[model samples]
Target: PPLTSAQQALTGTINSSMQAVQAAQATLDDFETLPPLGQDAASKAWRKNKMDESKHEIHSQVDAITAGTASVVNLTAGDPAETDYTAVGCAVTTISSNLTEMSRGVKLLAALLEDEGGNGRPLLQAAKGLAGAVSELLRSAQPASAEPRQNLLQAAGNVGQASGELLQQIGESDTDPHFQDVLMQLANAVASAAAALVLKAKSVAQRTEDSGLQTQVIAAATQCALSTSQLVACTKVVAPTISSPVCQEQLVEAGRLVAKAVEGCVSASQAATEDGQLLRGVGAAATAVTQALNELL
Candidate 1:
C-alpha cells in the first residue's frame, strides 16, 4: 500500500533524527584524545578512565537509538493512527533526551580541567562541538513540521565538522600508559550498566501492555541504577584526587536524579493499563545520563 501523508512525514523525521544521533555519538568519540584537566599522572589517569567508561555507555545508547529508529519506521509503515505516531514520538524523545544528557556530561568533565597556562583550545573546541551536536538531536526530536528535515541535515553537518576539527588537535601520545589497563575494567562495568538500560527501555516499549514483562523492565532499570551508584562510589576510590567532596556531591546528585527517573518509570508502569507505557523507562534513562554528565561537569 502507498504510504499516507502522516507516514511519509514520520518516516522522514525518524530517519533524520537517527542521523543526528549518529553524529552526536561520533562527536563524543572525538573527546577521547583531547587533553585532561589535571597535569598529574593520577589526575590524567582518572580522567581517561572515566571518559572511557562514559564512552562505553554512550556507545550502548547509540545502538539503542539505531534499533529503536528501525522499529519506529516499521511500525509507521501501515496506516498508523495519531496515537501510533504518539508512541513513536515518545521513543524518539527518549533517545534525544539521552543524547543531550550525554553531551552535557562530556562538557561537565571538560569544565573540570584547568586550561591554566596553555591555549586550552582543544577542550574548548570539543565542548562547543558537543553542545552543537546535542542541540541538533533535540531539534530533530521536534514534531514533524516544515523545518525538521532541514534542521536535522544541518545538525549532521555541524557535528561532523566540529568533531573533525577537534580530532585534529588531539595528540597521538599519552603520558600515563597504565591508565589504559584501568580503563578496561572501568569500561566493562560501565558497559554492562549502560547495556541494561538500553534493553530495559526497549522492553518497556515493546511490552507496554504486558504487566509481567513491564515488571522485568522495571527490575532491570533498578539494577542499572544500583550499578550507577556503585560506579559513583568506585570513582571515589579509583580517582581519589578528583574525588573531592565536590566530586562526591555531584555523584550523589546524579544518583538521586536517576532514582527519581526510576520513580517515573514506576509511575508509567502503573499507568500502563490505560496509555501505552512506551516512555516508561525513558525518564530514568535520561536521568541516568544526566548523572553521567553531572560527574563530568
Candidate 2:
C-alpha cells in the first residue's frame, strides 16, 4: 500500500529536521572541546566573538527546529488528513531554509578560528558531515522520475559514510548522556534514508523492463538493506543508555522497521535470484518500507 500525502509530508519533515539536529548537535559537541585561540589577547577576543556568534545562531536554529517538531507532533496527534499537512509542509520548508543559513554561519566561524590557529577543524569537519548527510537525504527523498539510480546510489553511500562518522564522534562523547539519545535518532534517520533508497530501487525494478537494470536495482536494494542493518547494530550498545521515553520509543520503532526491511530484502533477493521474477519481490520490500514510514511520520 502507498502512503498518504500527509504521511509522506510529515515523514519527510521529521527526517529533515533530524538531519539538522544531528549537525547542530555535532557542532555543539565540538564547541565543548575546542581550545582557546592564539595567546595574543586580540586574537583570543576575535575568536571568542566568532565562537559566540556561531553558538548563538546554532541555538536559535535548534530552538526553531524543536518548536517545528512539536508542531508536527501536535498537528499529527489525531488522524492527520491531507489538509493538516499544509501547515506542516510550510513549517518544514521554513526550518530547512533556516538550517542552511545556520550552516553558513558555522562555516564562517570555523574560518575565523582557523585564522587564529585554533582548534576549529573538528567543528568544521562535523559541520560538513552534517551538511553532507542533510543534502544526500534531501536528494534521496526526491521523486523517482526526478532521481536517477546512479544518483540514488551515490547519495546512499555518502549518507552511510557521513552518518557513520557522526556516530563515531558521538560514541567518543560518552560523558554526554544526551549524545546517546542523539545517536539513536541519527541512526534512525540514516537507516530510514537507506530504506528509502531500497524502495526507490524496488520501484525502478518493477517497470524497468530490462534484465540488466533489474539486476542493478536488486543489488542496490540489497546493499542498502545491509547498510541499514549495520547502522542499527552500531547503535545497539547505546540503546540501553537511552532513558527518555520518546527516545526509547523511537529506538524500538527504528529497530523494528529496519529489521522488517532487512527480512524483506533477504527474501526478495533470494526469490529474484532463484526465479528471475524481480517484480514479485517489490511488494514485500515496499510494504515494509511503507509501514516504517507510516510509523515514523
What is the C-alpha local distance difference test score of each model? 0.45, 0.50
RMSD of each: 15.8, 11.6
Model 1, residue 264: C-alpha shift (Å)? 43
Once fitted onto the true fold, the runs of candidate 1 whose alpha carbons sit more than 4 angstroms away are 1-44, 62-83, 111-144, 147-297
Q: Model 1 Cα displacement at 151 (Å)?
A: 6.7
- Candidate 1 residue pairs in clash (backbone atoms < 3 Å): 37-113, 105-293, 108-296, 108-297, 109-296, 109-297
Residue lDDT tens for model 1, 1-297:
565665566566557655665665556543335454467867766666665565444434333332333233223322236337656665565555555555545543444342333343355466455445545544554444445233443443344334334333332112133342353245344435455554556555466675665655555465454444434332422231222343334334434544554555555444554444445355445545554543443
Q: Model 2: per-residue lDDT, tens digit, 182-246?
A: 66576666666666658656665665564754675576577567646534543432233233344
User: Whose TM-score is greatest here?
Assistant: 2
Each model's TM-score? 0.31, 0.38
Q: Tell me the lDDT of candidate 2.
A: 0.50
